[PDB]
Structures are given as structure tokens and as C-alpha cells.
Amino acid sequence: MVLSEGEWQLVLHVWAKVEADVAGHGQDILIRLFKSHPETLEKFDRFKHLKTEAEMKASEDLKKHGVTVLTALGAILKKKGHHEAELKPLAQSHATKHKIPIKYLEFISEAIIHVLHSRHPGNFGADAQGAMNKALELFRKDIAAKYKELGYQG
Ligand code: HEM
Numbered sequence: 001m002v003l004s005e006g007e008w009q010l011v012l013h014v015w016a017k018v019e020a021d022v023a024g025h026g027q028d029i030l031i032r033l034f035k036s037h038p039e040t041l042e043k044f045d046r047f048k049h050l051k052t053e054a055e056m057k058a059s060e061d062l063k064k065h066g067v068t069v070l071t072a073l074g075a076i077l078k079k080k081g082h083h084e085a086e087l088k089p090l091a092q093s094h095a096t097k098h099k100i101p102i103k104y105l106e107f108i109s110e111a112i113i114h115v116l117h118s119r120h121p122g123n124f125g126a127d128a129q130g131a132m133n134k135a136l137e138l139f140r141k142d143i144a145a146k147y148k149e150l151g152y153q154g
Pocket residue numbers: 040041043044045046068069070072073089090093094098100104105108
């Protein structure tokens with residue numbers, strides 16, 4: 001797939017608003033993910049034990065990780081499709097060390113779209129959501145292909 005420059009503009013316009021508070025958007029997205037699909041939380045030896053949303057909000061460790069994740073995703077989106085290099089180390093660790101199925105990447109995509117919708121309704125109308133969905137589908141397809149090359153394709 002290939003996004004047009006107008007679609008990347010819609011994606012990087014909302015992302016510029018997310019960057020005003022990377023730690024708060026990280027926390028909202030990871031919590032939405034763990035709450036909606038609790039099986040994803042098991043993948044984290046570090047956070048598994050958290051029982052409620054209040055516990056999740058108070059974890060400084062979970063908030064730091066959410067900044068790591070959003071920074072890595074932000075550097076991929078700013079490449080506008082030319083992300084081959086950034087994707088390599090990400091795909092290798094998530095397919096070999098953490099073992100994350102493609103279906104869990106769909107679950108966090110949904111979580112990102114839910115939080116942008118709530119926090120940025122003015123900059124995330126239908127056309128901008130369609131461009132963000134296209135940018136994440138592109139990311140998942142390129143990661144799926146690398147998984148296969150690495151021997152996991154999950
Ligand atoms: C937006 C998609 C995602 C991005 C950009 C991302 C990014 C990262 C980054 C940068 C790290 C640190 C370095 C690394 O180990 O490679 C990380 C670690 C990790 N990721 Fe992801 N990730 C994504 C999706 C997920 C999902 C959906 C799961 C599981 C449901 C997952 C599970 C893990 C685990 C278990 C670690 C290790 C955390 C720790 O103990 O250090 N990732 N991720």
C-alpha cells in the first residue's frame with residue numbers, strides 16, 4: 001500500500017498534537033489496550049501483576065514504557081513509508097524475544113485510534129481517521145512480512 005502526501009499530512013497533523021503530551025497519550029493508550037484485551041497484559045513480566053486501572057495509572061514504569069513505545073512509533077510515522085530500517089530491530093525483538101502475534105498489533109492500533117478520537121475530535125474527523133488507519137495497516141503489513149522473513153509470522 002501507499003499513502004498519498006495528503007493522507008500523511010492528516011496523520012502527522014494529529015501526531016503533532018499527541019507529541020504535546022507524549023507521556024499522557026502513552027498512558028491512555030496502554031491502559032486502553034490492557035483493559036480492552038487483558039490477554040495482552042500477560043506478555044509483560046514487568047506489568048502482569050497490575051490488577052486495576054488505578055494501579056496502572058500509578059505505575060511510573062508503565063508510563064515510561066508508554067513514552068518509549070510512542071517515540072518509536074512516532075519515528076516510524078515521520079518516515080512516511082520509508083521505514084525499512086526502523087522496522088528491522090522492532091520486528092526482530094517482537095517476533096523472537098517477546099513473541100507478539102499480529103493480532104495484538106491490531107488491538108493496539110484500535111487503542112490508538114480510540115484515544116485520538118477521544119482527545120482530538122477536531123483534528124480526527126473521518127478523513128483523518130481513515131488516513132491514520134491506513135498508516136497503521138501499512139505498518140502492520142510491513143511488520144507481518146518481516147515476521148515471515150524472520151521465521152515467526154504470527
Ligand atoms: C505500536 C506498536 C508497538 C511498538 C511501536 C512497540 C515498541 C516497543 C519498543 C520500542 C520497545 C523497547 C525495545 C524492544 O524490546 O524492542 C517494546 C518492548 C516490548 N513490547 Fe512493544 N511495541 C509495540 C507493540 C507491542 C504489543 C502490541 C505488545 C504486546 C501485546 C508488545 C509487547 C512488548 C514487550 C513484552 C516488550 C518488552 C517490555 C519490557 O519489558 O522492556 N509490543 N515495544
